[PDB]
Amino acid sequence: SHMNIQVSLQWVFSHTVNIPPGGTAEQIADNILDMARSLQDEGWDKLTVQVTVNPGFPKETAMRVAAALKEAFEDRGLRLTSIETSGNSIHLKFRY
Amino acid sequence: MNIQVSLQWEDKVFSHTVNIPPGGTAEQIADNILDMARSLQDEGWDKLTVQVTVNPGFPKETAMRVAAALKEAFEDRGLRLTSIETSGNSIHLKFRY
Protein backbone atom coordinates (compact mmCIF):
# COMPACT_ATOMS: atom_id res chain seq x y z
CA SER A 1 0.00 0.00 0.00
CA HIS A 2 1.62 3.20 1.32
CA MET A 3 -0.46 5.10 -1.26
CA ASN A 4 -2.63 7.97 -0.02
CA ILE A 5 -5.63 9.60 -1.71
CA GLN A 6 -6.37 13.29 -1.16
CA VAL A 7 -9.54 15.09 -2.29
CA SER A 8 -10.02 18.86 -2.37
CA LEU A 9 -13.37 20.59 -2.94
CA GLN A 10 -13.40 24.10 -4.43
CA TRP A 11 -16.56 26.19 -4.83
CA VAL A 12 -13.54 31.38 -3.11
CA PHE A 13 -13.64 28.32 -0.85
CA SER A 14 -11.32 25.31 -0.68
CA HIS A 15 -11.71 22.17 1.46
CA THR A 16 -9.06 19.44 1.35
CA VAL A 17 -9.47 16.08 3.11
CA ASN A 18 -7.13 13.10 3.39
CA ILE A 19 -9.08 9.97 2.50
CA PRO A 20 -8.79 7.15 5.07
CA PRO A 21 -7.39 3.97 3.50
CA GLY A 22 -9.73 1.04 3.03
CA GLY A 23 -12.57 2.46 0.96
CA THR A 24 -13.40 1.77 -2.66
CA ALA A 25 -13.55 4.25 -5.53
CA GLU A 26 -17.36 4.24 -5.43
CA GLN A 27 -17.41 4.77 -1.65
CA ILE A 28 -14.89 7.62 -1.93
CA ALA A 29 -16.86 9.30 -4.71
CA ASP A 30 -20.13 8.90 -2.80
CA ASN A 31 -18.64 10.41 0.37
CA ILE A 32 -17.15 13.34 -1.56
CA LEU A 33 -20.43 14.18 -3.31
CA ASP A 34 -22.22 14.03 0.05
CA MET A 35 -19.77 16.61 1.42
CA ALA A 36 -20.31 18.75 -1.67
CA ARG A 37 -24.07 18.44 -1.10
CA SER A 38 -23.56 20.04 2.31
CA LEU A 39 -23.04 23.21 0.27
CA GLN A 40 -26.05 22.30 -1.86
CA ASP A 41 -28.34 24.35 -4.13
CA GLU A 42 -25.98 26.79 -5.85
CA GLY A 43 -22.93 24.76 -6.77
CA TRP A 44 -22.26 22.75 -9.92
CA ASP A 45 -20.19 24.57 -12.54
CA LYS A 46 -18.29 26.39 -9.78
CA LEU A 47 -17.60 23.11 -7.97
CA THR A 48 -14.15 21.69 -8.78
CA VAL A 49 -13.16 18.27 -7.44
CA GLN A 50 -9.41 17.61 -7.38
CA VAL A 51 -8.09 14.15 -6.47
CA THR A 52 -4.43 13.41 -5.75
CA VAL A 53 -2.83 9.95 -5.54
CA ASN A 54 0.31 10.09 -3.40
CA PRO A 55 2.75 8.81 -4.31
CA GLY A 56 2.76 8.44 -8.09
CA PHE A 57 4.65 5.13 -7.99
CA PRO A 58 4.33 2.31 -8.90
CA LYS A 59 3.03 4.01 -12.04
CA GLU A 60 0.94 1.01 -13.11
CA THR A 61 -0.69 0.76 -9.67
CA ALA A 62 -1.17 4.52 -9.26
CA MET A 63 -2.63 4.81 -12.77
CA ARG A 64 -5.14 2.05 -11.98
CA VAL A 65 -6.18 3.91 -8.83
CA ALA A 66 -6.58 7.10 -10.86
CA ALA A 67 -8.58 5.20 -13.49
CA ALA A 68 -10.95 3.69 -10.91
CA LEU A 69 -11.55 7.14 -9.41
CA LYS A 70 -12.14 8.47 -12.93
CA GLU A 71 -14.77 5.76 -13.45
CA ALA A 72 -16.62 6.57 -10.22
CA PHE A 73 -16.71 10.36 -10.62
CA GLU A 74 -17.67 10.25 -14.30
CA ASP A 75 -20.47 7.78 -13.57
CA ARG A 76 -21.81 10.43 -11.16
CA GLY A 77 -22.04 13.28 -13.69
CA LEU A 78 -18.59 14.82 -13.29
CA ARG A 79 -16.14 15.05 -16.18
CA LEU A 80 -12.35 14.69 -16.07
CA THR A 81 -10.99 18.07 -17.18
CA SER A 82 -7.33 17.63 -16.20
CA ILE A 83 -4.80 14.92 -15.38
CA GLU A 84 -1.15 15.44 -14.42
CA THR A 85 1.36 12.72 -13.50
CA SER A 86 4.23 14.96 -12.36
CA GLY A 87 5.41 15.94 -8.90
CA ASN A 88 5.64 12.53 -7.19
CA SER A 89 1.86 12.12 -7.54
CA ILE A 90 -1.06 11.88 -9.95
CA HIS A 91 -3.42 14.87 -9.93
CA LEU A 92 -6.97 14.71 -11.32
CA LYS A 93 -9.48 17.54 -11.77
CA PHE A 94 -13.23 16.96 -12.17
CA ARG A 95 -16.05 19.41 -12.87
CA TYR A 96 -19.82 19.21 -13.29
CA MET B 1 -7.15 26.89 -35.25
CA ASN B 2 -4.72 28.74 -32.98
CA ILE B 3 -1.69 26.88 -31.60
CA GLN B 4 0.65 28.20 -28.90
CA VAL B 5 3.81 26.40 -27.79
CA SER B 6 5.64 27.38 -24.60
CA LEU B 7 9.15 26.33 -23.59
CA GLN B 8 10.15 26.50 -19.92
CA TRP B 9 13.63 26.00 -18.46
CA GLU B 10 14.69 26.07 -14.81
CA ASP B 11 17.91 26.28 -12.82
CA LYS B 12 15.42 30.37 -11.53
CA VAL B 13 12.33 29.84 -13.70
CA PHE B 14 12.13 31.03 -17.32
CA SER B 15 9.55 30.51 -20.05
CA HIS B 16 8.96 31.68 -23.61
CA THR B 17 5.63 31.37 -25.43
CA VAL B 18 5.46 31.58 -29.23
CA ASN B 19 2.57 31.39 -31.68
CA ILE B 20 2.46 28.90 -34.55
CA PRO B 21 1.45 30.21 -38.00
CA PRO B 22 -1.52 28.41 -39.59
CA GLY B 23 0.56 26.81 -42.35
CA GLY B 24 2.87 24.61 -40.31
CA THR B 25 3.18 20.84 -40.01
CA ALA B 26 3.36 19.08 -36.66
CA GLU B 27 6.83 17.91 -37.71
CA GLN B 28 8.22 21.43 -38.13
CA ILE B 29 6.67 22.47 -34.81
CA ALA B 30 8.30 19.62 -32.88
CA ASP B 31 11.60 19.96 -34.75
CA ASN B 32 11.63 23.67 -33.90
CA ILE B 33 11.08 23.11 -30.17
CA LEU B 34 13.80 20.44 -30.15
CA ASP B 35 16.25 22.96 -31.61
CA MET B 36 15.35 25.56 -28.98
CA ALA B 37 15.63 22.93 -26.23
CA ARG B 38 18.96 21.53 -27.46
CA SER B 39 20.59 24.96 -27.08
CA LEU B 40 19.29 25.24 -23.51
CA GLN B 41 20.54 21.72 -22.76
CA ASP B 42 24.03 22.76 -23.87
CA GLU B 43 23.78 25.64 -21.39
CA GLY B 44 23.25 25.19 -17.66
CA TRP B 45 19.51 24.48 -17.57
CA ASP B 46 17.93 21.43 -15.93
CA LYS B 47 14.18 20.80 -16.01
CA LEU B 48 12.90 21.50 -19.53
CA THR B 49 9.12 21.57 -20.06
CA VAL B 50 7.13 22.08 -23.26
CA GLN B 51 3.48 23.19 -23.18
CA VAL B 52 1.21 23.14 -26.24
CA THR B 53 -2.14 24.94 -26.35
CA VAL B 54 -4.95 24.61 -28.90
CA ASN B 55 -7.03 27.74 -28.33
CA PRO B 56 -10.19 26.94 -30.39
CA GLY B 57 -11.77 23.89 -28.79
CA PHE B 58 -15.20 24.21 -30.38
CA PRO B 59 -14.90 21.20 -32.75
CA LYS B 60 -13.50 18.44 -30.54
CA GLU B 61 -13.04 16.24 -33.62
CA THR B 62 -10.35 18.53 -35.07
CA ALA B 63 -9.16 19.87 -31.70
CA MET B 64 -8.24 16.39 -30.48
CA ARG B 65 -6.74 15.43 -33.85
CA VAL B 66 -4.53 18.51 -33.70
CA ALA B 67 -3.63 17.58 -30.12
CA ALA B 68 -3.10 13.92 -31.03
CA ALA B 69 -0.93 14.94 -33.99
CA LEU B 70 1.30 17.20 -31.89
CA LYS B 71 1.42 14.57 -29.13
CA GLU B 72 2.82 11.89 -31.44
CA ALA B 73 5.23 14.39 -33.02
CA PHE B 74 6.79 15.27 -29.66
CA GLU B 75 6.76 11.69 -28.35
CA ASP B 76 8.54 10.44 -31.48
CA ARG B 77 11.31 12.93 -30.55
CA GLY B 78 11.87 11.89 -26.93
CA LEU B 79 9.34 14.09 -25.12
CA ARG B 80 7.09 12.48 -22.51
CA LEU B 81 3.53 13.72 -22.03
CA THR B 82 2.92 14.60 -18.38
CA SER B 83 -0.30 16.67 -18.32
CA ILE B 84 -3.54 16.98 -20.28
CA GLU B 85 -6.06 19.71 -19.45
CA THR B 86 -9.25 20.86 -21.19
CA SER B 87 -10.39 24.08 -19.53
CA GLY B 88 -11.18 27.59 -20.71
CA ASN B 89 -12.27 26.32 -24.14
CA SER B 90 -8.65 25.22 -24.72
CA ILE B 91 -6.66 21.98 -24.71
CA HIS B 92 -3.29 22.10 -22.95
CA LEU B 93 -0.55 19.47 -23.23
CA LYS B 94 2.60 19.56 -21.08
CA PHE B 95 5.66 17.51 -22.05
CA ARG B 96 8.97 16.64 -20.39
CA TYR B 97 12.19 16.97 -22.38
3 state SS for A8-57: EEECCCEEEEEECCCCCHHHHHHHHHHHHHHHCCCCCCCCEEEEEEECCC
What is the maximal distance between C-alpha atoms in chain B?
41
CATH at residue A23:
3.30.1710
CB atoms closer than 10 angstroms to residue A14:
10
Angle at A55 between CA A54 and CA A59, to 5 degrees: 120
Distance CA A67, CA A61 (A): 10
Angle at A57 between CA A52 and CA A61, to 5 degrees: 85
Resolution, given in Å to one decimal, reads 2.4
Angle at B31 between CA B21 and CA B54, to 5 degrees: 45
Structural domain containing residue A66: 4-95
Please give the tally of structural domains in chain A. Answer: 1
Asked if the structure places residue B1 within a domain, the reply is no
Experimental method: X-ray
Asked if the structure places residue B26 within a domain, the reply is yes
Residue A94 vs residues A8, A27, A71, B10, B76: alpha-carbon distances, Å? 10, 17, 11, 29, 30
Residues 61-90 of B with CB under 8 A from A: 82-87
Say whether the peptide bond before residue B59 is cis (omega within 30 degrees of 0): no
Which one of A78, A79, A81, A95 makes the best mutation probe of the B interface by having the most chain B beta carbons within 10 Å? Answer: A81
